[PDB]
Design an enzyme around this catalytic site. Sequence first.
Site, PDB file in Angstrom:
ATOM      1  N   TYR A  77      23.643  -1.373 -28.268  1.00  0.00           N
ATOM      2  CA  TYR A  77      23.071  -1.841 -27.006  1.00  0.00           C
ATOM      3  C   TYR A  77      23.386  -3.313 -26.890  1.00  0.00           C
ATOM      4  O   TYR A  77      23.156  -4.017 -27.858  1.00  0.00           O
ATOM      5  CB  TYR A  77      21.545  -1.660 -26.972  1.00  0.00           C
ATOM      6  CG  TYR A  77      21.154  -0.206 -26.896  1.00  0.00           C
ATOM      7  CD1 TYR A  77      21.027   0.523 -28.082  1.00  0.00           C
ATOM      8  CD2 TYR A  77      21.024   0.457 -25.674  1.00  0.00           C
ATOM      9  CE1 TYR A  77      20.860   1.919 -28.068  1.00  0.00           C
ATOM     10  CE2 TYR A  77      20.871   1.848 -25.625  1.00  0.00           C
ATOM     11  CZ  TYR A  77      20.816   2.564 -26.832  1.00  0.00           C
ATOM     12  OH  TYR A  77      20.583   3.908 -26.792  1.00  0.00           O
ATOM     13  N   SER A  78      23.950  -3.754 -25.755  1.00  0.00           N
ATOM     14  CA  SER A  78      24.162  -5.219 -25.656  1.00  0.00           C
ATOM     15  C   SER A  78      22.808  -5.922 -25.594  1.00  0.00           C
ATOM     16  O   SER A  78      21.876  -5.399 -25.069  1.00  0.00           O
ATOM     17  CB  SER A  78      24.908  -5.662 -24.411  1.00  0.00           C
ATOM     18  OG  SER A  78      25.867  -4.663 -24.096  1.00  0.00           O
ATOM     19  N   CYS A 254      31.453  -5.694 -17.922  1.00  0.00           N
ATOM     20  CA  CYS A 254      30.663  -4.853 -18.844  1.00  0.00           C
ATOM     21  C   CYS A 254      30.000  -3.739 -18.093  1.00  0.00           C
ATOM     22  O   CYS A 254      29.524  -3.969 -17.015  1.00  0.00           O
ATOM     23  CB  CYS A 254      29.591  -5.743 -19.541  1.00  0.00           C
ATOM     24  SG  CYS A 254      28.649  -4.848 -20.804  1.00  0.00           S
ATOM     25  N   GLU A 294      33.923  -4.918 -22.166  1.00  0.00           N
ATOM     26  CA  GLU A 294      33.046  -4.028 -22.985  1.00  0.00           C
ATOM     27  C   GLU A 294      32.491  -2.901 -22.091  1.00  0.00           C
ATOM     28  O   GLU A 294      31.511  -3.022 -21.333  1.00  0.00           O
ATOM     29  CB  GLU A 294      31.899  -4.801 -23.720  1.00  0.00           C
ATOM     30  CG  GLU A 294      30.976  -3.799 -24.462  1.00  0.00           C
ATOM     31  CD  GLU A 294      29.662  -4.400 -24.733  1.00  0.00           C
ATOM     32  OE1 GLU A 294      29.813  -5.439 -25.424  1.00  0.00           O
ATOM     33  OE2 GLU A 294      28.613  -4.076 -24.249  1.00  0.00           O
ATOM     34  N   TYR A 296      31.597   1.373 -21.364  1.00  0.00           N
ATOM     35  CA  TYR A 296      31.235   2.496 -22.234  1.00  0.00           C
ATOM     36  C   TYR A 296      30.758   3.623 -21.332  1.00  0.00           C
ATOM     37  O   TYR A 296      30.733   3.444 -20.078  1.00  0.00           O
ATOM     38  CB  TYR A 296      30.067   2.078 -23.215  1.00  0.00           C
ATOM     39  CG  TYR A 296      28.939   1.254 -22.501  1.00  0.00           C
ATOM     40  CD1 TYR A 296      27.881   1.890 -21.861  1.00  0.00           C
ATOM     41  CD2 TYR A 296      28.947  -0.150 -22.520  1.00  0.00           C
ATOM     42  CE1 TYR A 296      26.904   1.144 -21.194  1.00  0.00           C
ATOM     43  CE2 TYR A 296      27.956  -0.925 -21.923  1.00  0.00           C
ATOM     44  CZ  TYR A 296      26.939  -0.250 -21.242  1.00  0.00           C
ATOM     45  OH  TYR A 296      25.866  -0.893 -20.679  1.00  0.00           O
TER      46      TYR A 296
HETATM   47  C1  LIG Z   1      29.010  -1.622 -26.872  1.00  0.00           C
HETATM   48  C2  LIG Z   1      28.007  -0.763 -26.199  1.00  0.00           C
HETATM   49  C3  LIG Z   1      26.973  -1.341 -25.525  1.00  0.00           C
HETATM   50  C4  LIG Z   1      26.120  -0.547 -24.831  1.00  0.00           C
HETATM   51  N1  LIG Z   1      25.088  -1.182 -24.228  1.00  0.00           N
HETATM   52  C5  LIG Z   1      24.198  -0.397 -23.707  1.00  0.00           C
HETATM   53  C6  LIG Z   1      23.147  -1.014 -22.877  1.00  0.00           C
HETATM   54  O1  LIG Z   1      22.910  -2.161 -22.911  1.00  0.00           O
HETATM   55  N2  LIG Z   1      22.278  -0.185 -22.329  1.00  0.00           N
HETATM   56  C7  LIG Z   1      22.391   1.216 -22.356  1.00  0.00           C
HETATM   57  O2  LIG Z   1      21.591   1.885 -21.741  1.00  0.00           O
HETATM   58  N3  LIG Z   1      23.409   1.767 -23.005  1.00  0.00           N
HETATM   59  C8  LIG Z   1      24.268   1.016 -23.632  1.00  0.00           C
HETATM   60  N4  LIG Z   1      25.240   1.606 -24.277  1.00  0.00           N
HETATM   61  C9  LIG Z   1      25.171   3.089 -24.282  1.00  0.00           C
HETATM   62  C10 LIG Z   1      24.289   3.537 -25.525  1.00  0.00           C
HETATM   63  O3  LIG Z   1      25.008   3.124 -26.716  1.00  0.00           O
HETATM   64  C11 LIG Z   1      24.037   5.057 -25.601  1.00  0.00           C
HETATM   65  O4  LIG Z   1      25.298   5.765 -25.544  1.00  0.00           O
HETATM   66  C12 LIG Z   1      23.230   5.568 -24.426  1.00  0.00           C
HETATM   67  O5  LIG Z   1      21.940   4.953 -24.438  1.00  0.00           O
HETATM   68  C13 LIG Z   1      23.080   7.125 -24.559  1.00  0.00           C
HETATM   69  O6  LIG Z   1      22.784   7.487 -25.952  1.00  0.00           O
HETATM   70  P1  LIG Z   1      21.595   8.593 -26.243  1.00  0.00           P
HETATM   71  O7  LIG Z   1      21.502   8.629 -27.754  1.00  0.00           O
HETATM   72  O8  LIG Z   1      20.416   8.505 -25.315  1.00  0.00           O
HETATM   73  O9  LIG Z   1      22.430   9.921 -25.762  1.00  0.00           O
HETATM   74  P2  LIG Z   1      23.113  11.066 -26.751  1.00  0.00           P
HETATM   75  O10 LIG Z   1      21.981  11.926 -27.267  1.00  0.00           O
HETATM   76  O11 LIG Z   1      24.124  10.416 -27.569  1.00  0.00           O
HETATM   77  O12 LIG Z   1      23.805  11.850 -25.493  1.00  0.00           O
HETATM   78  C14 LIG Z   1      25.137  11.309 -25.207  1.00  0.00           C
HETATM   79  C15 LIG Z   1      26.020  12.452 -24.809  1.00  0.00           C
HETATM   80  O13 LIG Z   1      25.441  12.913 -23.562  1.00  0.00           O
HETATM   81  C16 LIG Z   1      26.508  13.702 -22.914  1.00  0.00           C
HETATM   82  N5  LIG Z   1      26.542  13.434 -21.469  1.00  0.00           N
HETATM   83  C17 LIG Z   1      26.302  12.260 -20.734  1.00  0.00           C
HETATM   84  N6  LIG Z   1      26.268  12.501 -19.421  1.00  0.00           N
HETATM   85  C18 LIG Z   1      26.558  13.844 -19.333  1.00  0.00           C
HETATM   86  C19 LIG Z   1      26.747  14.727 -18.208  1.00  0.00           C
HETATM   87  N7  LIG Z   1      26.648  14.322 -16.961  1.00  0.00           N
HETATM   88  N8  LIG Z   1      27.049  16.029 -18.538  1.00  0.00           N
HETATM   89  C20 LIG Z   1      27.163  16.473 -19.830  1.00  0.00           C
HETATM   90  N9  LIG Z   1      27.020  15.725 -20.898  1.00  0.00           N
HETATM   91  C21 LIG Z   1      26.723  14.452 -20.586  1.00  0.00           C
HETATM   92  C22 LIG Z   1      27.796  13.444 -23.617  1.00  0.00           C
HETATM   93  O14 LIG Z   1      27.922  14.554 -24.519  1.00  0.00           O
HETATM   94  C23 LIG Z   1      27.446  12.143 -24.383  1.00  0.00           C
HETATM   95  O15 LIG Z   1      28.306  11.776 -25.419  1.00  0.00           O
HETATM   96  C24 LIG Z   1      26.198   0.882 -24.941  1.00  0.00           C
HETATM   97  C25 LIG Z   1      27.238   1.474 -25.637  1.00  0.00           C
HETATM   98  C26 LIG Z   1      28.147   0.662 -26.240  1.00  0.00           C
HETATM   99  C27 LIG Z   1      29.276   1.294 -26.990  1.00  0.00           C
END
Ligand SMILES: Cc1cc2nc3c(=O)[nH]c(=O)nc-3n(C[C@H](O)[C@H](O)[C@H](O)COP(=O)(O)OP(=O)(O)OC[C@H]3O[C@@H](n4cnc5c(N)ncnc54)[C@H](O)[C@@H]3O)c2cc1C
Length: 296
Positions: A77-78, A254, A294, A296
């Site tokens: 998360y940034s 970003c 950046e 994602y």
């Molecule tokens: C460098 C970086 C910085 C980031 N900064 C932030 C930030 O500041 N704030 C933030 O909110 N997030 C940010 N993210 C995103 C964060 O890392 C997570 O990916 C995000 O919060 C979702 O993770 P989760 O564990 O809730 O979802 P998970 O349980 O990991 O679910 C993710 C999966 O959901 C699925 N998915 C998503 N949409 C759909 C769809 N429409 N249909 C089917 N499948 C779908 C895909 O399989 C995906 O890989 C960042 C990511 C990176 C790499």
Amino acid sequence: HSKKMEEGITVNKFKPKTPYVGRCLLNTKITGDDAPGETWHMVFSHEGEIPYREGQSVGVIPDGEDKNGKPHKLRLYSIASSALGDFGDAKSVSLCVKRLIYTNDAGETIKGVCSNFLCDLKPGAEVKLTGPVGKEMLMPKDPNATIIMLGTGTGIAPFRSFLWKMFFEKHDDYKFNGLAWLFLGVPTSSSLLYKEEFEKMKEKAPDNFRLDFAVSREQTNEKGEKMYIQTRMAQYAVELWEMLKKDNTYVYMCGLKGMEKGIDDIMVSLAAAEGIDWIEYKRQLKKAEQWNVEVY
Ligand SMILES: Cc1cc2nc3c(=O)[nH]c(=O)nc-3n(C[C@H](O)[C@H](O)[C@H](O)COP(=O)(O)OP(=O)(O)OC[C@H]3O[C@@H](n4cnc5c(N)ncnc54)[C@H](O)[C@@H]3O)c2cc1C
Ligand SMILES: Nc1ncnc2c1ncn2[C@@H]1O[C@H](COP(=O)(O)O)[C@@H](O)[C@H]1OP(=O)(O)O
């Protein structure tokens, strides 16, 4: 060598096998009920143990196990707070997090793991963090730089970080005097993240800060096209193009991976008009540390 504030940064002081355990102080929903989705701003205590800089990220390890009975993988998360933090004491860290909700193949609603864990946090709860991570989004050393910031949704996070440092803080060795121009793409007016803070900044430094919003579901251009960030950028094309030609201009982008193409779509055309191949020019900018991404 670097044009960025890379000296003495910390990286991975804490790792997944040995995270830092902090506590939730506050967790507030910052989008309106109208909004398509929820975005929350949450602040955690780290007591000064995580020495991050503006532009870096932290890893969060959501509580529970994966399907193999292992701990969940970290999500990045940034950081949405400046190095001193929202309280000015350098002991807290803030995140901007969208609650991820989707439907699988079978029509079943699935909640994203880390995002729902984080948005459901109550003051007092513990959270495992790692990092800091990152060098790509560090600010330029030049206090007189032109800094253009292009974010979509939660991608506002690092820019909030930068701007607090620039405009809400007093520093012994840094005084910003350049031009900061933020473009922020969100879906609705009930989704304009940290707008009240940016409006205070604008009032403080009218000559040093420009602000443009692209409210996708409420705004259309003349052709009645949806106001995406690139859509809004086009309205300033000549201006931006001129800016890109200067050595003291730094672009940071970003947010959603999708925005990257849309912007390249606008630039390809702008440049070709001057007889420039955007693809090579962009490569040169990236190498000169002026085009920082950046998504994602
Ligand atoms: C460098 C970086 C910085 C980031 N900064 C932030 C930030 O500041 N704030 C933030 O909110 N997030 C940010 N993210 C995103 C964060 O890392 C997570 O990916 C995000 O919060 C979702 O993770 P989760 O564990 O809730 O979802 P998970 O349980 O990991 O679910 C993710 C999966 O959901 C699925 N998915 C998503 N949409 C759909 C769809 N429409 N249909 C089917 N499948 C779908 C895909 O399989 C995906 O890989 C960042 C990511 C990176 C790499
Ligand atoms: N490919 C894209 N290029 C630019 N903006 C995009 C793109 N895809 C989505 N958006 C917009 O990015 C913002 C993401 O913010 P949030 O996370 O709060 O939804 C929205 O305004 C979303 O617009 P829309 O959803 O109306 O297509």
